[model samples]
Target: MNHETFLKRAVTLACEGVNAGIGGPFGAVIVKDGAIIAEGQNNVTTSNDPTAHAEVTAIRKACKVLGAYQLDDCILYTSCEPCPMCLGAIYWARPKAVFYAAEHTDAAEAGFDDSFIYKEIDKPAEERTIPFYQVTLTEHLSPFQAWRNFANKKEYL
Candidate 1:
């Protein structure tokens, strides 16, 4: 299904989000039957809403597009790993699988906290109900590196 191609699209969305000054560098795309159903970028800071994460936004849009709450037939591609909140949303929406570029450690290196995976979920990623795959992308941190220098880091808080 050309996972690499879709993953790159997600990365491009993340870059666009950062350039648009919406929030941190994050993006997500939902695909059904090899076609993109929905796409979203971080809009938390701009919307001043905490739940406006990339994954959550895309899930919500996909639900609306499909007129259903469950995404059991879809695959979600994200520019980076989902945080605890996004993961919870993904779990509820029940996407068939998740594909991501950056790892949790990469997020941590960018000063993002992603500890909820074990603190609350109590299971390794492999044991989780949804499968997660990490795609190799060296430019994963390109947008984030610029965001780290922003004076308004509080937007993320």
Candidate 2:
């Protein structure tokens, strides 16, 4: 899939996850050679697993389905910036790069906290090695503003 299409799919999956009452609204898709191999959404609210966050869930499934550990040849599209935990998962899982629709600033603007994420990923030493987002956030994030809005609900906590 192309970048825009892949991200759009990620956003849709995020909405789906929220629609299912799974967890925070977010989605991730793993791509190899421009084709999506697996996808996942935030599922902590349902599965009660920290790894149920979109990127981890997707990466785990992709690794299993591909029957390999090294994902350096793959790319991931996540609807939001992977949190500190999910970013660690991406590094360990070894996706070549990541494409994201929303940044931490956008996440905070949407009411999701991102402190740990910035504190870790922003380390000067960790700078070039992290799964930092390499794209503009708005075009891809616009469609999911509603999902973020709903996810921002205090009752959802």
Candidate 3:
């Protein structure tokens, strides 16, 4: 699907997950044209498992599910900066574009690594390299402010 369509569908899915309380600290993502189409947060994980930021989980889930379908040129979207595990997983999945909503400075401080991009891709043997970017939520605002908003809205944690 196109970016707009993909984003709309992804948002709907996130909302559905949120209303049903199925994906706690869940993340939602849509991919298209080797780029991130849409991404959002549903809830946060309770354990010390890297917080499982909704956005990061969504991207990883999308990557895994889409990979299973043999689809490439996909985009990834999430609500927060990816944790080390999620980033490693996505790197392994190797989507064309990865888009996230917010950056988690605190999480990074908690031992999260952002250097995965330097790693080489080893999938499909010849797929396009992955590109990662974090979308600006409310321009001119600090990351702490954005994180605070995410924490407040994501009450299922």
CA-lDDT, candidates in order: 0.89, 0.83, 0.55
Model 1 — TM-score against the truth? 0.73
Across residues 1-157, which tens digit of lDDT does each residue of candidate 2 receive? 4799999999999998888888888999999977788999988868878668888889988999898776869999999888888877888888889999988788788788868656765676526445555676668877667667786454311
Those runs of model 1 whose alpha carbons end farther than 4 Å from true positions after fitting are 116-157
Off by over 4 Å in 2: 117-157
Q: What overall lDDT, based on C-alpha atoms, would model 2 receive against the true structure?
A: 0.83
Candidate closest to the true structure, highest lDDT: 1
For candidate 1, the per-residue lDDT at 81 reads 90
Q: Best to worst by lDDT, what's the order?
A: 1, 2, 3
Per-residue C-alpha lDDT of model 1 across residues 58-115, encoded as one tens digit per residue: 9999999998889978999999999888988888899999999998888888887777
Deviation from native of the Cα of residue 6 in model 2, angstroms: 0.3
